[PDB]
Amino acid sequence: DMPVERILEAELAVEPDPVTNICQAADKQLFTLVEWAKRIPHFSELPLDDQVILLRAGWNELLIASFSHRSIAVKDGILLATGLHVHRNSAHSAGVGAIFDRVLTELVSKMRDMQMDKTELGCLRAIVLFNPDSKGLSNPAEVEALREKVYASLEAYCKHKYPEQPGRFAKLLLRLPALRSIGLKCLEHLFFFKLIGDTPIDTFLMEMLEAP
Amino acid sequence: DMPVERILEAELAVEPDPVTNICQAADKQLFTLVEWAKRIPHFSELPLDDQVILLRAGWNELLIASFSHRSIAVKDGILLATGLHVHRNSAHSAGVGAIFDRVLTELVSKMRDMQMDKTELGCLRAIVLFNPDSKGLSNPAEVEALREKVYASLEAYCKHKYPEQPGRFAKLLLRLPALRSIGLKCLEHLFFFKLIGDTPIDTFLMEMLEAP
Amino acid sequence: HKILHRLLQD
Amino acid sequence: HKILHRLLQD
Ligand SMILES: CC1(C)CCC(C)(C)c2cc3c(cc21)CC[C@]1(CCc2cc(C(=O)O)ccc2O1)O3
Ligand SMILES: CC1(C)CCC(C)(C)c2cc3c(cc21)CC[C@]1(CCc2cc(C(=O)O)ccc2O1)O3
């Protein structure tokens, strides 16, 4: 089964110019993200090749959702795992204001307004991790079955913790399209920074951007 | 309220080289899409400026979901509203094989395997239409409230029509991230065809691609 | 956006 | 992908 307790432990086990600071922190969190994934139930039992495919497919959305939830109490800014607050004025003045505002409006503010807890965040990240549409998986059905168990557990958790909010489970799932769209746009920026070549991109972040 | 009956009537009221054929059909369906949206409850009561913002924001995903569901009984291909079947061999041999296979694998096949009915399709399209994250809406809350009513109705409909499938409501919502990703990639292709300039793009399709 | 406005006006 | 394989092997 897929108990939300274990998913919550995985989140708590990994708790801690602007473009350069964000790219450096991203490389640091990629190491932490592997440790998180190995604590998600049944992920390590998957074929090694598929664990790679899932992490290469979801790392961007997984880590974007992480810092978004970490930034709840931050006003008009985000909090990186290194402890650095990046304010939206800094992002605008570095040329990435539009996508930064998208994170604040579509992700951080929505997480703040509903008070998304760390169990719901973990389940949402687990759903993203267990992405059955990832190309090249040796068995898409197994990953789809794992995703179904996660959101069967998360719905039951929502209905128990927040009985007064019937649409809350659906509200959580309906932030994934925004997360998908924002992840893709952030990838486009990274590839541009790489192309220009004056932004420090460390080895692990660089490996995520290379071809399969 | 947001009765699924009315949403279903909206779908039934509008029922009917490859890149050129698809772009021509897209322009034709844009006119039909306006008529569909005006039959979705409370959409026409929104401010005119917001009806424009919602349609300019969602037209691609709305029409991609339409032809995807229309292509259920089609094997290895899609069925355009003009009655033309586009087979995946034609798409590959025209240079758009990868995104075409994404539609078949992530959308058409999933709709086929679960036998998504036209009521669930309409509700999914209504959710996409009522996108509260659309930039520039004069009142995002009103659009969000309309989206909540749609998926409150769709969940209750799923639990009544298919009591034996508890995760079906969630399964429907979890196709929206793929639809979001595929819509964006299709937009990238359109802008490339426009840039090259030898693909016929008619006036309505062209207007969707122009700046706000 | 001429066309979309004109069709939504009906 | 050297790094990801090595960390998943542990
Ligand atoms: C600079 C740019 C393009 C614009 C601003 C935003 C915030 C959208 C962003 C975000 C952005 C990336 C780039 C950008 C690269 C990938 C990535 C992935 C998520 C992430 C999390 C943390 C953390 O958990 O500490 C630190 C860094 C990090 O980097 O996220
Ligand atoms: C050629 C290309 C890039 C690759 C193949 C696919 C199918 C992905 C595609 C799809 C694709 C568009 C382009 C492409 C443009 C926008 C659009 C929007 C949805 C749509 C629906 C119908 C219908 O309902 O009849 C007809 C056309 C139509 O056009 O959808």
Side-chain angles (χ1 to χ4, degrees):
Chain A
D1 63 338
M2 185 73 62
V4 297
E5 286 73 26
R6 302 261 332 269
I7 302 179
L8 164 69
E9 330 197 310
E11 294 290 332
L12 299 156
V14 298
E15 285 193 2
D17 67 278
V19 171
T20 302
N21 292 320
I22 293 172
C23 290
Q24 291 189 349
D27 187 89
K28 164 67 181 304
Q29 287 310 98
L30 280 177
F31 294 94
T32 296
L33 166 76
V34 168
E35 294 306 310
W36 169 84
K38 294 192 295 179
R39 294 174 172 267
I40 297 297
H42 309 296
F43 177 84
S44 293
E45 304 159 359
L46 293 173
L48 183 50
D49 287 326
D50 295 336
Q51 303 176 36
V52 175
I53 289 172
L54 292 178
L55 281 172
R56 288 183 51 85
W59 69 269
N60 201 24
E61 306 183 19
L62 289 172
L63 290 181
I64 284 165
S66 276
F67 83 77
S68 288
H69 189 267
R70 196 187 304 116
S71 304
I72 288 317
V74 183
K75 71 101 208 162
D76 304 325
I78 63 179
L79 174 57
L80 305 173
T82 55
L84 172 65
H85 298 77
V86 174
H87 191 260
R88 67 179 298 267
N89 293 338
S90 307
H92 183 80
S93 59
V96 296
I99 182 57
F100 196 94
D101 287 346
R102 286 203 60 192
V103 167
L104 292 188
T105 308
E106 293 170 49
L107 293 180
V108 179
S109 305
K110 306 288 183 111
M111 293 172 171
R112 182 200 60 237
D113 286 9
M114 69 179 303
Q115 278 303 321
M116 176 191 296
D117 61 45
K118 297 182 180 179
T119 296
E120 304 169 305
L121 170 74
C123 294
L124 278 181
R125 298 182 77 221
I127 289 174
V128 167
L129 179 68
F130 292 133
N131 178 7
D133 297 308
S134 302
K135 309 302 176 181
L137 299 163
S138 67
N139 187 14
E142 187 178 10
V143 174
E144 171 171 82
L146 289 176
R147 164 178 280 207
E148 290 165 342
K149 265 121 176 156
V150 175
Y151 67 70
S153 286
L154 165 74
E155 180 177 24
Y157 165 91
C158 291
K159 282 168 161 44
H160 169 262
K161 198 75 176 65
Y162 312 99
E164 74 285 3
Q165 303 165 222
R168 183 169 170 111
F169 171 65
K171 171 184 274 298
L172 294 168
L173 296 183
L174 290 170
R175 290 295 93 201
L176 295 179
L179 176 63
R180 171 69 54 92
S181 183
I182 290 177
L184 289 164
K185 183 97 274 184
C186 291
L187 268 189
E188 280 177 80
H189 280 90
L190 283 182
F191 278 114
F192 182 75
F193 307 148
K194 172 194 182 174
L195 179 72
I196 280 44
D198 309 332
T199 298
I201 302 174
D202 299 321
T203 65
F204 204 172
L205 182 62
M206 191 92 272
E207 183 180 296
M208 297 309 237
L209 309 172
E210 77 188 357
Chain B
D1 63 338
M2 185 73 62
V4 297
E5 286 73 26
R6 302 261 332 269
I7 302 179
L8 164 69
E9 330 197 310
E11 294 290 332
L12 299 156
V14 298
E15 285 193 2
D17 67 278
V19 171
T20 302
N21 292 320
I22 293 172
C23 290
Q24 291 189 349
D27 187 89
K28 164 67 181 304
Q29 287 310 98
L30 280 177
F31 294 94
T32 296
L33 166 76
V34 168
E35 294 306 310
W36 169 84
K38 294 192 295 179
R39 294 174 172 267
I40 297 297
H42 309 296
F43 177 84
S44 293
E45 304 159 359
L46 293 173
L48 183 50
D49 287 326
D50 295 336
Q51 303 176 36
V52 175
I53 289 172
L54 292 178
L55 281 172
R56 288 183 51 85
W59 69 269
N60 201 24
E61 306 183 19
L62 289 172
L63 290 181
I64 284 165
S66 276
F67 83 77
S68 288
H69 189 267
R70 196 187 304 116
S71 304
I72 288 317
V74 183
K75 71 101 208 162
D76 304 325
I78 63 179
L79 174 57
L80 305 173
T82 55
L84 172 65
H85 298 77
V86 174
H87 191 260
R88 67 179 298 267
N89 293 338
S90 307
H92 183 80
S93 59
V96 296
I99 182 57
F100 196 94
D101 287 346
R102 286 203 60 192
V103 167
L104 292 188
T105 308
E106 293 170 49
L107 293 180
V108 179
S109 305
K110 306 288 183 111
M111 293 172 171
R112 182 200 60 237
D113 286 9
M114 69 179 303
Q115 278 303 321
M116 176 191 296
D117 61 45
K118 297 182 180 179
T119 296
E120 304 169 305
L121 170 74
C123 294
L124 278 181
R125 298 182 77 221
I127 289 174
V128 167
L129 179 68
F130 292 133
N131 178 7
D133 297 308
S134 302
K135 309 302 176 181
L137 299 163
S138 67
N139 187 14
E142 187 178 10
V143 174
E144 171 171 82
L146 289 176
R147 164 178 280 207
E148 290 165 342
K149 265 121 176 156
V150 175
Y151 67 70
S153 286
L154 165 74
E155 180 177 24
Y157 165 91
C158 291
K159 282 168 161 44
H160 169 262
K161 198 75 176 65
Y162 312 99
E164 74 285 3
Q165 303 165 222
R168 183 169 170 111
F169 171 65
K171 171 184 274 298
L172 294 168
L173 296 183
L174 290 170
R175 290 295 93 201
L176 295 179
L179 176 63
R180 171 69 54 92
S181 183
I182 290 177
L184 289 164
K185 183 97 274 184
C186 291
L187 268 189
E188 280 177 80
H189 280 90
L190 283 182
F191 278 114
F192 182 75
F193 307 148
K194 172 194 182 174
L195 179 72
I196 280 44
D198 309 332
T199 298
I201 302 174
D202 299 321
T203 65
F204 204 172
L205 182 62
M206 191 92 272
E207 183 180 296
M208 297 309 237
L209 309 172
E210 77 188 357
Chain C
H1 321 114
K2 292 187 179 300
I3 301 162
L4 185 52
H5 276 87
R6 291 171 179 171
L7 294 166
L8 291 170
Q9 164 252 350
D10 83 86
Chain D
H1 321 114
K2 292 187 179 300
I3 301 162
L4 185 52
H5 276 87
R6 291 171 179 171
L7 294 166
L8 291 170
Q9 164 252 350
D10 83 86

